[PDB]
Amino acid sequence: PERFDATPPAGEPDRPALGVLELTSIARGITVADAALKRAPSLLLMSRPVSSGKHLLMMRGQVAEVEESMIAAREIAGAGSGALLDELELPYAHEQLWRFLDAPVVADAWEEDTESVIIVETATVCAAIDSADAALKTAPVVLRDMRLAIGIAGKAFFTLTGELADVEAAAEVVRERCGARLLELACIARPVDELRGRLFF
Amino acid sequence: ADALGMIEVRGFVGMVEAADAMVKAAKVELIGYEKTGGGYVTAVVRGDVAAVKAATEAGQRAAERVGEVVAVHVIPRPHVNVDAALPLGRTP
Amino acid sequence: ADALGMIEVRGFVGMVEAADAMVKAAKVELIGYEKTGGGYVTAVVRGDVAAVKAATEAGQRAAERVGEVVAVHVIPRPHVNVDAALPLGRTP
Amino acid sequence: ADALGMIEVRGFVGMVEAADAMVKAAKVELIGYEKTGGGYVTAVVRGDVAAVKAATEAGQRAAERVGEVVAVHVIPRPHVNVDAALPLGRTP
Amino acid sequence: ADALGMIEVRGFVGMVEAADAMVKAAKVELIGYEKTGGGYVTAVVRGDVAAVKAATEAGQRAAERVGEVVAVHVIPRPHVNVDAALPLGRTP
Amino acid sequence: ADALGMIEVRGFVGMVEAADAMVKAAKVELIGYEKTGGGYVTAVVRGDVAAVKAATEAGQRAAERVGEVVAVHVIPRPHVNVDAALPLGRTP
Amino acid sequence: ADALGMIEVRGFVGMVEAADAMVKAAKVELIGYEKTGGGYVTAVVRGDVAAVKAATEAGQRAAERVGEVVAVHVIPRPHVNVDAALPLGRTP
Amino acid sequence: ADALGMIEVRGFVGMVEAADAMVKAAKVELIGYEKTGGGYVTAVVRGDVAAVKAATEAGQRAAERVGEVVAVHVIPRPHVNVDAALPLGRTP
Amino acid sequence: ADALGMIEVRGFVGMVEAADAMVKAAKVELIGYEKTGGGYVTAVVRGDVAAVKAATEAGQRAAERVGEVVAVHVIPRPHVNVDAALPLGRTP
């Protein structure tokens, strides 16, 4: 479970890229997985069947290796029956995004320097990870908690915190990078002291 | 550090009007100006993204009345390799 | 040694947006910028060939929106005389 | 001393690509580049006459793919007053 | 004093070809070149009047093949105010 | 092990130009060449996937000028039986 | 003894792609390749009949994309005279 | 090391004529000839770049009078991996 | 040494008829023959220039009755590197 870290150790090669596949079937989920591991040497992070019956693949490697594994993976997935629901290929994922991939991490406390909070939910996992990556890159926000299609039937949400202007810039970039996959966004400009830090409980 | 905002004007006069309207619009800081030659100058303000986002849209409105505006853009958070390589005002 | 990537923009604003999008797209290092006069300014990133090949194609897509892109090109291995003569950030 | 080779490009990117193609094509010495303002930059290689004649015709072919080449010329024996007055990397 | 000859080229390469043909046509003295910005440069030779009259008409013939020639002119007797005020190689 | 790249040319000269452009454009290793008779020769380079993916598409561009390119293909992971059977330069 | 499988391609690159796809598609044994001259090379795999029947029908699909496939055939039992007279891998 | 020149002829007679015209044009060293099968034979000269650029342009002019010339190409600086892998006469 | 003369026939039979006509037409010395694959065979006679100039024009006349003559050529004084490298019968 130490393969989800941002930087590798000194005796390991560097793998900054990321690729997320989301498939309506589980059988060709495994076919897409080992085809992508046949073509290019991508370290596969997970091959996990998540709720609403869909298989979620996450792979990690260098930029060319992840790109080549993803082009093999999408020439296998779209074979007659279009069972590729959504895809994502980040050439460089943000450092605060890596440890929210394996398990659903929830947040229990904030700091006193937390003005505002934004909660984003998308219909897919790929749109959630894409919008979280874009919003972490463009603005000094902190990703607090994130759920990816387990227990909530395919939907995926995440919350960011920070200054109100920063989380509204993140709201703009999330609404641009999702477009039609964003279900509904909420911009809490000042959360209640009975709810700061402890939202889902 | 803070967010970035820019008005590029082909002409010094439109840039001075834009740089006045930006610092009168919202709480920004005119760090200076960049002369890229050929008559193009670029006024650079810094501040949090709501203030520079109001300041640049006031400076574009006040600078098109006096000259030629080339480009208006706001970066909410410049990367640490941009402030440390480009003369934008937060070079350590 | 490391691969070379360049975005030339007629305008400082589009060049700063391109140089920000390149360093946010992949692990590249913005070594600097070149002012050839006449409004043309060139941002230079430098890193391994897949990362700069993604970074420059992100910076072109983010620089056509606000600026005038003159040239986008990636050199996967510049020769040692290029780095020894031209100011590309890896001068020995 | 050695023969002269020049590629003038309106743009830093085409000049760097031309310089890279010249130093990869033959045994030439990229001594620098001249900035005459307005976006014109001139890459100057220097070596014996057949090597620079192959190098400039490789760099012209590789630089028109990435930009607009103004002038290509090879001088087989630059005069000593030319090397003494013009900055061609052989000023005594 | 001595007669004055000039080739102005929009571009460095045509100016180097002109300044080479002027010193290879006759016995002149290439005192240097003036960079008036925007790409316009001017090679300035200076010598006795028949030599510069042959040198400039060889440099004009050789510089039209490679570049954009703006102006060619010979001054047989420049006034002493022109020498003392302009950078023409014979400033006392 | 390392990724694979091949240029098959009906002609030795186009194969030599392809094998020169592949080892100049990126960091690959020309392990040899395979003669299959009838005029077909295959240059085989071998390196990591980004370098060979740039090198084969540079060698295809440089080999269509002088020769007849038959096939260009990149195998990013050649299987261990392929390296143990076919002569690809990494047979244990 | 073991079942036989063959992909003949006019070209070394298509044969290498087919030989990679056969040993990645199923558990077969790539024993070598036969060079009958004139550009034709034949990759020969050898294993039990389901594995070679899947491996050749995947290697034909992968080799038609990159080259020219001449003949594909699977022999479930080659006769002992065929294995003793032809170089097919199991010559005693 | 030295520059490289090749004439490929479908036929031994045209290749001998090209290999004679190359060594009679200038001082080059005919290291030999490569037989890729199918009637294609390639005469390979290897010497300094002016001599091989005159040699191959005489051999192309003299080999098209008697035979079928496939490819003519000059490499002024072949890479050290090209000399180490391909049999070009200067194998270390 | 002596003058070189060649017939190339796509076919052994026409080459033997051409060799017989060459050695009967004048005082030449049939040193051997060269096989470049594809059915191309070159008969090589070697004698002084009038004898081989009569012999090859007799062998071409006798070989066009039975075969497909590709090339006929006479070299009056073959270069010493051509006799040293190419297999012409007088290798020292």
mmCIF file with all atom_site columns, N, CA and C in Angstrom, chain D residues 4 6-8 10 34-38 40 42 44 70-79 81-82 85-88, chain E residues 10-17 19-20 23-24 28-33 35-41 62 66-68:
data_model
loop_
_atom_site.group_PDB
_atom_site.id
_atom_site.type_symbol
_atom_site.label_atom_id
_atom_site.label_alt_id
_atom_site.label_comp_id
_atom_site.label_asym_id
_atom_site.label_entity_id
_atom_site.label_seq_id
_atom_site.pdbx_PDB_ins_code
_atom_site.Cartn_x
_atom_site.Cartn_y
_atom_site.Cartn_z
_atom_site.occupancy
_atom_site.B_iso_or_equiv
_atom_site.pdbx_formal_charge
_atom_site.auth_seq_id
_atom_site.auth_comp_id
_atom_site.auth_asym_id
_atom_site.auth_atom_id
_atom_site.pdbx_PDB_model_num
ATOM 1   N N  . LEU D 1 4  ? 32.295 30.705 -43.067 1.00 0.00 ? 4  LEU D N  1
ATOM 2   C CA . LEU D 1 4  ? 31.217 31.288 -42.285 1.00 0.00 ? 4  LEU D CA 1
ATOM 3   C C  . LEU D 1 4  ? 29.885 30.704 -42.727 1.00 0.00 ? 4  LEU D C  1
ATOM 4   N N  . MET D 1 6  ? 25.516 31.204 -41.886 1.00 0.00 ? 6  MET D N  1
ATOM 5   C CA . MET D 1 6  ? 24.514 31.969 -41.161 1.00 0.00 ? 6  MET D CA 1
ATOM 6   C C  . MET D 1 6  ? 23.113 31.543 -41.551 1.00 0.00 ? 6  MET D C  1
ATOM 7   N N  . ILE D 1 7  ? 22.250 31.415 -40.549 1.00 0.00 ? 7  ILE D N  1
ATOM 8   C CA . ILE D 1 7  ? 20.811 31.296 -40.757 1.00 0.00 ? 7  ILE D CA 1
ATOM 9   C C  . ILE D 1 7  ? 20.154 32.415 -39.972 1.00 0.00 ? 7  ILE D C  1
ATOM 10  N N  . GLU D 1 8  ? 19.488 33.330 -40.661 1.00 0.00 ? 8  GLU D N  1
ATOM 11  C CA . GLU D 1 8  ? 18.718 34.361 -39.984 1.00 0.00 ? 8  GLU D CA 1
ATOM 12  C C  . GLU D 1 8  ? 17.252 33.962 -39.965 1.00 0.00 ? 8  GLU D C  1
ATOM 13  N N  . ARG D 1 10 ? 13.386 35.034 -38.268 1.00 0.00 ? 10 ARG D N  1
ATOM 14  C CA . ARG D 1 10 ? 12.518 35.911 -37.488 1.00 0.00 ? 10 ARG D CA 1
ATOM 15  C C  . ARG D 1 10 ? 11.863 35.049 -36.419 1.00 0.00 ? 10 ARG D C  1
ATOM 16  N N  . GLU D 1 34 ? 23.370 36.595 -33.247 1.00 0.00 ? 34 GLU D N  1
ATOM 17  C CA . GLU D 1 34 ? 23.299 38.050 -33.304 1.00 0.00 ? 34 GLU D CA 1
ATOM 18  C C  . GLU D 1 34 ? 21.845 38.498 -33.271 1.00 0.00 ? 34 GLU D C  1
ATOM 19  N N  . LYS D 1 35 ? 21.558 39.484 -32.424 1.00 0.00 ? 35 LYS D N  1
ATOM 20  C CA . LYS D 1 35 ? 20.208 39.998 -32.203 1.00 0.00 ? 35 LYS D CA 1
ATOM 21  C C  . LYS D 1 35 ? 20.136 41.408 -32.772 1.00 0.00 ? 35 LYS D C  1
ATOM 22  N N  . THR D 1 36 ? 19.527 41.546 -33.947 1.00 0.00 ? 36 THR D N  1
ATOM 23  C CA . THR D 1 36 ? 19.416 42.835 -34.611 1.00 0.00 ? 36 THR D CA 1
ATOM 24  C C  . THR D 1 36 ? 18.095 43.534 -34.326 1.00 0.00 ? 36 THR D C  1
ATOM 25  N N  . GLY D 1 37 ? 17.345 43.075 -33.335 1.00 0.00 ? 37 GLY D N  1
ATOM 26  C CA . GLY D 1 37 ? 16.089 43.697 -32.979 1.00 0.00 ? 37 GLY D CA 1
ATOM 27  C C  . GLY D 1 37 ? 14.965 43.347 -33.937 1.00 0.00 ? 37 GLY D C  1
ATOM 28  N N  . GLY D 1 38 ? 13.741 43.589 -33.479 1.00 0.00 ? 38 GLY D N  1
ATOM 29  C CA . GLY D 1 38 ? 12.582 43.300 -34.294 1.00 0.00 ? 38 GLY D CA 1
ATOM 30  C C  . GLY D 1 38 ? 12.253 41.835 -34.439 1.00 0.00 ? 38 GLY D C  1
ATOM 31  N N  . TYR D 1 40 ? 14.424 39.478 -35.325 1.00 0.00 ? 40 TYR D N  1
ATOM 32  C CA . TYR D 1 40 ? 15.416 38.814 -36.155 1.00 0.00 ? 40 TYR D CA 1
ATOM 33  C C  . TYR D 1 40 ? 16.567 38.328 -35.290 1.00 0.00 ? 40 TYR D C  1
ATOM 34  N N  . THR D 1 42 ? 20.196 35.794 -35.778 1.00 0.00 ? 42 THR D N  1
ATOM 35  C CA . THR D 1 42 ? 21.074 35.176 -36.768 1.00 0.00 ? 42 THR D CA 1
ATOM 36  C C  . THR D 1 42 ? 21.989 34.177 -36.075 1.00 0.00 ? 42 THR D C  1
ATOM 37  N N  . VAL D 1 44 ? 25.111 31.788 -36.216 1.00 0.00 ? 44 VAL D N  1
ATOM 38  C CA . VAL D 1 44 ? 26.376 31.835 -36.934 1.00 0.00 ? 44 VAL D CA 1
ATOM 39  C C  . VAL D 1 44 ? 27.182 30.601 -36.557 1.00 0.00 ? 44 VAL D C  1
ATOM 40  N N  . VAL D 1 70 ? 14.759 34.104 -43.103 1.00 0.00 ? 70 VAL D N  1
ATOM 41  C CA . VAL D 1 70 ? 14.990 35.310 -43.887 1.00 0.00 ? 70 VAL D CA 1
ATOM 42  C C  . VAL D 1 70 ? 16.109 35.090 -44.899 1.00 0.00 ? 70 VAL D C  1
ATOM 43  N N  . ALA D 1 71 ? 17.281 34.671 -44.427 1.00 0.00 ? 71 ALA D N  1
ATOM 44  C CA . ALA D 1 71 ? 18.451 34.614 -45.288 1.00 0.00 ? 71 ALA D CA 1
ATOM 45  C C  . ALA D 1 71 ? 19.358 33.458 -44.894 1.00 0.00 ? 71 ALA D C  1
ATOM 46  N N  . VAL D 1 72 ? 19.921 32.800 -45.905 1.00 0.00 ? 72 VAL D N  1
ATOM 47  C CA . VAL D 1 72 ? 20.911 31.739 -45.746 1.00 0.00 ? 72 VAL D CA 1
ATOM 48  C C  . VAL D 1 72 ? 22.109 32.102 -46.606 1.00 0.00 ? 72 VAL D C  1
ATOM 49  N N  . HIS D 1 73 ? 23.301 32.127 -46.012 1.00 0.00 ? 73 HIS D N  1
ATOM 50  C CA . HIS D 1 73 ? 24.475 32.426 -46.816 1.00 0.00 ? 73 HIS D CA 1
ATOM 51  C C  . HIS D 1 73 ? 25.717 31.792 -46.208 1.00 0.00 ? 73 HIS D C  1
ATOM 52  N N  . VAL D 1 74 ? 26.633 31.387 -47.086 1.00 0.00 ? 74 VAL D N  1
ATOM 53  C CA . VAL D 1 74 ? 27.922 30.819 -46.718 1.00 0.00 ? 74 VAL D CA 1
ATOM 54  C C  . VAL D 1 74 ? 29.014 31.680 -47.332 1.00 0.00 ? 74 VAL D C  1
ATOM 55  N N  . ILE D 1 75 ? 29.949 32.131 -46.507 1.00 0.00 ? 75 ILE D N  1
ATOM 56  C CA . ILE D 1 75 ? 31.145 32.822 -46.973 1.00 0.00 ? 75 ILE D CA 1
ATOM 57  C C  . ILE D 1 75 ? 32.325 31.871 -46.812 1.00 0.00 ? 75 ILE D C  1
ATOM 58  N N  . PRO D 1 76 ? 32.994 31.473 -47.900 1.00 0.00 ? 76 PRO D N  1
ATOM 59  C CA . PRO D 1 76 ? 34.099 30.509 -47.765 1.00 0.00 ? 76 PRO D CA 1
ATOM 60  C C  . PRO D 1 76 ? 35.331 31.083 -47.094 1.00 0.00 ? 76 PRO D C  1
ATOM 61  N N  . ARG D 1 77 ? 35.658 32.345 -47.352 1.00 0.00 ? 77 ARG D N  1
ATOM 62  C CA . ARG D 1 77 ? 36.804 33.002 -46.725 1.00 0.00 ? 77 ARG D CA 1
ATOM 63  C C  . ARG D 1 77 ? 36.370 34.396 -46.313 1.00 0.00 ? 77 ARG D C  1
ATOM 64  N N  . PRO D 1 78 ? 35.939 34.576 -45.068 1.00 0.00 ? 78 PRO D N  1
ATOM 65  C CA . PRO D 1 78 ? 35.638 35.930 -44.598 1.00 0.00 ? 78 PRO D CA 1
ATOM 66  C C  . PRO D 1 78 ? 36.914 36.732 -44.418 1.00 0.00 ? 78 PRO D C  1
ATOM 67  N N  . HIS D 1 79 ? 36.887 37.955 -44.939 1.00 0.00 ? 79 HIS D N  1
ATOM 68  C CA . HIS D 1 79 ? 38.038 38.842 -44.938 1.00 0.00 ? 79 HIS D CA 1
ATOM 69  C C  . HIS D 1 79 ? 38.392 39.242 -43.508 1.00 0.00 ? 79 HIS D C  1
ATOM 70  N N  . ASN D 1 81 ? 39.152 42.074 -42.235 1.00 0.00 ? 81 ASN D N  1
ATOM 71  C CA . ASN D 1 81 ? 38.446 43.257 -41.756 1.00 0.00 ? 81 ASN D CA 1
ATOM 72  C C  . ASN D 1 81 ? 37.029 42.907 -41.317 1.00 0.00 ? 81 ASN D C  1
ATOM 73  N N  . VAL D 1 82 ? 36.407 41.925 -41.974 1.00 0.00 ? 82 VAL D N  1
ATOM 74  C CA . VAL D 1 82 ? 35.071 41.478 -41.588 1.00 0.00 ? 82 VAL D CA 1
ATOM 75  C C  . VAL D 1 82 ? 35.105 40.793 -40.228 1.00 0.00 ? 82 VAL D C  1
ATOM 76  N N  . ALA D 1 85 ? 35.808 43.573 -37.537 1.00 0.00 ? 85 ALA D N  1
ATOM 77  C CA . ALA D 1 85 ? 34.747 44.534 -37.253 1.00 0.00 ? 85 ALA D CA 1
ATOM 78  C C  . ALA D 1 85 ? 33.443 43.874 -36.822 1.00 0.00 ? 85 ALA D C  1
ATOM 79  N N  . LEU D 1 86 ? 32.972 42.895 -37.573 1.00 0.00 ? 86 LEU D N  1
ATOM 80  C CA . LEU D 1 86 ? 31.704 42.253 -37.260 1.00 0.00 ? 86 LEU D CA 1
ATOM 81  C C  . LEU D 1 86 ? 31.904 41.187 -36.182 1.00 0.00 ? 86 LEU D C  1
ATOM 82  N N  . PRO D 1 87 ? 30.948 41.030 -35.260 1.00 0.00 ? 87 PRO D N  1
ATOM 83  C CA . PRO D 1 87 ? 31.082 40.015 -34.190 1.00 0.00 ? 87 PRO D CA 1
ATOM 84  C C  . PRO D 1 87 ? 30.813 38.593 -34.678 1.00 0.00 ? 87 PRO D C  1
ATOM 85  N N  . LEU D 1 88 ? 31.845 37.975 -35.250 1.00 0.00 ? 88 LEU D N  1
ATOM 86  C CA . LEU D 1 88 ? 31.717 36.650 -35.840 1.00 0.00 ? 88 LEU D CA 1
ATOM 87  C C  . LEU D 1 88 ? 32.500 35.595 -35.072 1.00 0.00 ? 88 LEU D C  1
ATOM 88  N N  . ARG E 1 10 ? 17.875 45.164 -44.172 1.00 0.00 ? 10 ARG E N  1
ATOM 89  C CA . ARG E 1 10 ? 16.974 44.610 -43.165 1.00 0.00 ? 10 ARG E CA 1
ATOM 90  C C  . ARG E 1 10 ? 17.394 43.165 -42.939 1.00 0.00 ? 10 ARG E C  1
ATOM 91  N N  . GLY E 1 11 ? 18.318 42.970 -42.016 1.00 0.00 ? 11 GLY E N  1
ATOM 92  C CA . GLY E 1 11 ? 18.841 41.651 -41.713 1.00 0.00 ? 11 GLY E CA 1
ATOM 93  C C  . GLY E 1 11 ? 20.349 41.661 -41.577 1.00 0.00 ? 11 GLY E C  1
ATOM 94  N N  . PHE E 1 12 ? 20.854 40.783 -40.714 1.00 0.00 ? 12 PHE E N  1
ATOM 95  C CA . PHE E 1 12 ? 22.283 40.735 -40.437 1.00 0.00 ? 12 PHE E CA 1
ATOM 96  C C  . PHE E 1 12 ? 23.058 40.034 -41.542 1.00 0.00 ? 12 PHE E C  1
ATOM 97  N N  . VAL E 1 13 ? 22.449 39.041 -42.195 1.00 0.00 ? 13 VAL E N  1
ATOM 98  C CA . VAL E 1 13 ? 23.170 38.201 -43.148 1.00 0.00 ? 13 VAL E CA 1
ATOM 99  C C  . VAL E 1 13 ? 23.481 38.969 -44.426 1.00 0.00 ? 13 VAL E C  1
ATOM 100 N N  . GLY E 1 14 ? 22.501 39.715 -44.940 1.00 0.00 ? 14 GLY E N  1
ATOM 101 C CA . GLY E 1 14 ? 22.745 40.562 -46.094 1.00 0.00 ? 14 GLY E CA 1
ATOM 102 C C  . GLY E 1 14 ? 23.750 41.660 -45.814 1.00 0.00 ? 14 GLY E C  1
ATOM 103 N N  . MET E 1 15 ? 23.780 42.156 -44.576 1.00 0.00 ? 15 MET E N  1
ATOM 104 C CA . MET E 1 15 ? 24.767 43.162 -44.202 1.00 0.00 ? 15 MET E CA 1
ATOM 105 C C  . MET E 1 15 ? 26.165 42.563 -44.129 1.00 0.00 ? 15 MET E C  1
ATOM 106 N N  . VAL E 1 16 ? 26.284 41.310 -43.683 1.00 0.00 ? 16 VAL E N  1
ATOM 107 C CA . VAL E 1 16 ? 27.599 40.673 -43.639 1.00 0.00 ? 16 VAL E CA 1
ATOM 108 C C  . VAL E 1 16 ? 28.092 40.361 -45.048 1.00 0.00 ? 16 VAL E C  1
ATOM 109 N N  . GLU E 1 17 ? 27.189 39.924 -45.935 1.00 0.00 ? 17 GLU E N  1
ATOM 110 C CA . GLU E 1 17 ? 27.559 39.710 -47.335 1.00 0.00 ? 17 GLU E CA 1
ATOM 111 C C  . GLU E 1 17 ? 27.957 41.013 -48.022 1.00 0.00 ? 17 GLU E C  1
ATOM 112 N N  . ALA E 1 19 ? 29.162 43.771 -46.431 1.00 0.00 ? 19 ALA E N  1
ATOM 113 C CA . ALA E 1 19 ? 30.412 44.212 -45.830 1.00 0.00 ? 19 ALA E CA 1
ATOM 114 C C  . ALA E 1 19 ? 31.587 43.343 -46.240 1.00 0.00 ? 19 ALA E C  1
ATOM 115 N N  . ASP E 1 20 ? 31.332 42.106 -46.655 1.00 0.00 ? 20 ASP E N  1
ATOM 116 C CA . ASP E 1 20 ? 32.395 41.272 -47.191 1.00 0.00 ? 20 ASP E CA 1
ATOM 117 C C  . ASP E 1 20 ? 32.715 41.644 -48.631 1.00 0.00 ? 20 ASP E C  1
ATOM 118 N N  . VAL E 1 23 ? 34.762 44.996 -48.819 1.00 0.00 ? 23 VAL E N  1
ATOM 119 C CA . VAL E 1 23 ? 36.187 44.925 -48.524 1.00 0.00 ? 23 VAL E CA 1
ATOM 120 C C  . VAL E 1 23 ? 36.919 43.986 -49.475 1.00 0.00 ? 23 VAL E C  1
ATOM 121 N N  . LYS E 1 24 ? 36.205 43.120 -50.197 1.00 0.00 ? 24 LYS E N  1
ATOM 122 C CA . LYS E 1 24 ? 36.847 42.318 -51.229 1.00 0.00 ? 24 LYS E CA 1
ATOM 123 C C  . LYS E 1 24 ? 36.835 42.974 -52.601 1.00 0.00 ? 24 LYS E C  1
ATOM 124 N N  . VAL E 1 28 ? 39.174 49.323 -48.942 1.00 0.00 ? 28 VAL E N  1
ATOM 125 C CA . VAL E 1 28 ? 38.390 50.191 -48.075 1.00 0.00 ? 28 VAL E CA 1
ATOM 126 C C  . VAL E 1 28 ? 38.674 49.786 -46.640 1.00 0.00 ? 28 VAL E C  1
ATOM 127 N N  . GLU E 1 29 ? 38.059 50.477 -45.688 1.00 0.00 ? 29 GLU E N  1
ATOM 128 C CA . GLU E 1 29 ? 38.188 50.142 -44.276 1.00 0.00 ? 29 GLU E CA 1
ATOM 129 C C  . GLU E 1 29 ? 36.792 50.000 -43.692 1.00 0.00 ? 29 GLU E C  1
ATOM 130 N N  . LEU E 1 30 ? 36.402 48.771 -43.381 1.00 0.00 ? 30 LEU E N  1
ATOM 131 C CA . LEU E 1 30 ? 35.134 48.515 -42.707 1.00 0.00 ? 30 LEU E CA 1
ATOM 132 C C  . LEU E 1 30 ? 35.273 48.940 -41.254 1.00 0.00 ? 30 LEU E C  1
ATOM 133 N N  . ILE E 1 31 ? 34.800 50.145 -40.935 1.00 0.00 ? 31 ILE E N  1
ATOM 134 C CA . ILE E 1 31 ? 34.906 50.627 -39.565 1.00 0.00 ? 31 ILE E CA 1
ATOM 135 C C  . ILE E 1 31 ? 33.872 49.976 -38.661 1.00 0.00 ? 31 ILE E C  1
ATOM 136 N N  . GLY E 1 32 ? 32.775 49.494 -39.214 1.00 0.00 ? 32 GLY E N  1
ATOM 137 C CA . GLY E 1 32 ? 31.812 48.767 -38.429 1.00 0.00 ? 32 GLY E CA 1
ATOM 138 C C  . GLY E 1 32 ? 30.417 48.869 -39.031 1.00 0.00 ? 32 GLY E C  1
ATOM 139 N N  . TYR E 1 33 ? 29.438 48.962 -38.139 1.00 0.00 ? 33 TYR E N  1
ATOM 140 C CA . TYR E 1 33 ? 28.043 48.798 -38.509 1.00 0.00 ? 33 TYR E CA 1
ATOM 141 C C  . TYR E 1 33 ? 27.181 49.455 -37.447 1.00 0.00 ? 33 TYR E C  1
ATOM 142 N N  . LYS E 1 35 ? 23.367 49.591 -35.700 1.00 0.00 ? 35 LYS E N  1
ATOM 143 C CA . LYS E 1 35 ? 22.142 48.837 -35.444 1.00 0.00 ? 35 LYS E CA 1
ATOM 144 C C  . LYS E 1 35 ? 21.068 49.823 -35.007 1.00 0.00 ? 35 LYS E C  1
ATOM 145 N N  . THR E 1 36 ? 20.238 50.251 -35.951 1.00 0.00 ? 36 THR E N  1
ATOM 146 C CA . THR E 1 36 ? 19.176 51.201 -35.664 1.00 0.00 ? 36 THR E CA 1
ATOM 147 C C  . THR E 1 36 ? 17.894 50.531 -35.189 1.00 0.00 ? 36 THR E C  1
ATOM 148 N N  . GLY E 1 37 ? 17.946 49.251 -34.847 1.00 0.00 ? 37 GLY E N  1
ATOM 149 C CA . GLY E 1 37 ? 16.803 48.552 -34.303 1.00 0.00 ? 37 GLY E CA 1
ATOM 150 C C  . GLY E 1 37 ? 15.779 48.177 -35.361 1.00 0.00 ? 37 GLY E C  1
ATOM 151 N N  . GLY E 1 38 ? 14.904 47.249 -34.989 1.00 0.00 ? 38 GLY E N  1
ATOM 152 C CA . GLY E 1 38 ? 13.857 46.807 -35.883 1.00 0.00 ? 38 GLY E CA 1
ATOM 153 C C  . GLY E 1 38 ? 14.307 45.888 -36.991 1.00 0.00 ? 38 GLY E C  1
ATOM 154 N N  . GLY E 1 39 ? 15.547 45.412 -36.952 1.00 0.00 ? 39 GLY E N  1
ATOM 155 C CA . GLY E 1 39 ? 16.102 44.576 -37.985 1.00 0.00 ? 39 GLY E CA 1
ATOM 156 C C  . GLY E 1 39 ? 16.976 45.307 -38.979 1.00 0.00 ? 39 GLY E C  1
ATOM 157 N N  . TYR E 1 40 ? 16.898 46.634 -39.018 1.00 0.00 ? 40 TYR E N  1
ATOM 158 C CA . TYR E 1 40 ? 17.703 47.424 -39.938 1.00 0.00 ? 40 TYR E CA 1
ATOM 159 C C  . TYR E 1 40 ? 19.114 47.551 -39.388 1.00 0.00 ? 40 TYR E C  1
ATOM 160 N N  . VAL E 1 41 ? 20.110 47.151 -40.178 1.00 0.00 ? 41 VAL E N  1
ATOM 161 C CA . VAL E 1 41 ? 21.507 47.372 -39.830 1.00 0.00 ? 41 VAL E CA 1
ATOM 162 C C  . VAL E 1 41 ? 22.204 47.990 -41.032 1.00 0.00 ? 41 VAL E C  1
ATOM 163 N N  . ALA E 1 62 ? 26.029 42.285 -54.529 1.00 0.00 ? 62 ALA E N  1
ATOM 164 C CA . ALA E 1 62 ? 26.122 41.042 -53.779 1.00 0.00 ? 62 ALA E CA 1
ATOM 165 C C  . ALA E 1 62 ? 25.090 40.924 -52.667 1.00 0.00 ? 62 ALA E C  1
ATOM 166 N N  . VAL E 1 66 ? 20.962 38.032 -51.372 1.00 0.00 ? 66 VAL E N  1
ATOM 167 C CA . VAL E 1 66 ? 20.753 37.312 -50.123 1.00 0.00 ? 66 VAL E CA 1
ATOM 168 C C  . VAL E 1 66 ? 19.795 38.011 -49.167 1.00 0.00 ? 66 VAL E C  1
ATOM 169 N N  . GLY E 1 67 ? 19.538 39.310 -49.310 1.00 0.00 ? 67 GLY E N  1
ATOM 170 C CA . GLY E 1 67 ? 18.739 39.997 -48.321 1.00 0.00 ? 67 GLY E CA 1
ATOM 171 C C  . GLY E 1 67 ? 17.998 41.187 -48.890 1.00 0.00 ? 67 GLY E C  1
ATOM 172 N N  . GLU E 1 68 ? 17.289 41.878 -48.001 1.00 0.00 ? 68 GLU E N  1
ATOM 173 C CA . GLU E 1 68 ? 16.505 43.058 -48.351 1.00 0.00 ? 68 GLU E CA 1
ATOM 174 C C  . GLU E 1 68 ? 17.380 44.294 -48.187 1.00 0.00 ? 68 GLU E C  1
#
